[PDB]
Amino acid sequence: PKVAENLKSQLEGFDKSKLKK
Amino acid sequence: TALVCDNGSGLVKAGFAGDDAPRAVFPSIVGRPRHQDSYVGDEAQSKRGILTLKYPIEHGIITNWDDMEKIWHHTFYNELRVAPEEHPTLLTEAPLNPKANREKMTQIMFETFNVPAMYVAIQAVLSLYASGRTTGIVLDSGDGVTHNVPIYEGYALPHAIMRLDLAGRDLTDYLMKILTERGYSFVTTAEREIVRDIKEKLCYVALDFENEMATAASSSSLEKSYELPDGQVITIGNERFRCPETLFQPSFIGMESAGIHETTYNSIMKCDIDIRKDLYANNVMSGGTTMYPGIADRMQKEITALAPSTMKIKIIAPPERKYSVWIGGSILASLSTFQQMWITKQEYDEAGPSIVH
Ligand SMILES: Nc1ncnc2c1ncn2[C@@H]1O[C@H](COP(=O)(O)OP(=O)(O)OP(=O)(O)O)[C@@H](O)[C@H]1O
Ligand SMILES: [Mg+2]
Q1: Residue B86 vs residues B76, B82, B117, B256: alpha-carbon distances, Å
Q2: Which of A3, A11, A12 to mutate: most B Cβ within 10 Å?
Q3: Which CATH architecture has domain B166-257?
Q4: Count of Cβ atoms closer than 10 Å to residue B49 Cβ
Q5: Do A21 and B20 touch (CB under 8 A)?
Q6: Which residue has the CA at smallest separation from atom 8 of ligand 1?
Q7: Which CATH number fits domain B124-165+258-324: 3.40.50.10320, 3.30.420.40, 2.80.10.50, 2.30.30.50?
Q8: Nearest Cα to B186, choosing from B199, B198, B177?
Q9: What is the CA radius of gyration of chain B?
Q10: How far apart are CA B203 and CA B244, in angstroms?
């Protein structure tokens, strides 16, 4: 009941621009 | 480093976490010497004459473990060039995969390759996580299977999943068939590639099928030309959309399924009435077979007409939808907050393959 919310946040907030090429 | 590996009937997209694009992309096939000593991927395709070919993943579900074991060996050592003992490995499965299949994936990953740790997720979820979302219904359409997959707050709803046993492979045959019916000769597996290249470069979803039938008949404006490696010019006109329509009207190959639009509707109406609105606005698409131009347009139209007149309907068709599965798994596996989700070897040693549940 704690693990989800932070992962949800990183997942929805993620900028794909951050991924290497 | 963490590894990401997506196991399709059609293609094994592989590479490393935090990357925006898989380094290894190859057919999902084991080859063995016909007579009288084994190859994977493009090297198994190029030597299809003296090797007995096999699709260990057909239709999304791993059917043979020695073959898929050979295909995981090859992903590590040939395509990526890694020592599997030192990398967390995120593996993707199909929707509604049997428990026994999912237990065997873990058992094999810790025991043959001795990974430091692993995790399994569901493709559709991974194409959702790629588009920025944690809620919504994903149309997943690959080479050999298709799925509708509803998702609420990060998790697929198993009781509301819908499957269409027709994907890109079936549209290639149908096309092959249709050009055959028009005088052409396409038999062998190795001629198939030509037809597939016709299908991908030239095919498209008609926004309205009968208007389009009317347009192809009254004008040359839809006629296309492609030049075989032998010299002939095949002029295709209505074949361009008649092929992909099979997604919406499958009885074009003799099936009983409703099209990807009704199954999108049903898969929404087997869900909590109060989450439905969120599905309708979050209808993301993914897979090579959703690559056709005009698909998200024709989907929009079909759902609008099925869904109450005021319902906001948004269809998302990310331009890189062909790799979203992998792209989601790349993103997932590097975030800081996921790192303690990995099944470790020691959890496995103490719990068994049943821990994967
Ligand atoms: N540009 C394109 N336009 C239309 N169809 C395409 C395109 N590129 C690939 N496809 C089709 O999609 C299929 C491969 O897609 P994808 O990599 O999503 O499948 P996959 O994950 O292997 O499918 P499965 O889940 O059955 O393994 C092939 O059948 C191919 O014909
Ligand atoms: Mg797939």
Answers
A1: 11, 9, 9, 48
A2: A11
A3: Alpha-Beta Complex (3.90)
A4: 7
A5: yes
A6: B288
A7: 3.30.420.40
A8: B177
A9: 21
A10: 7
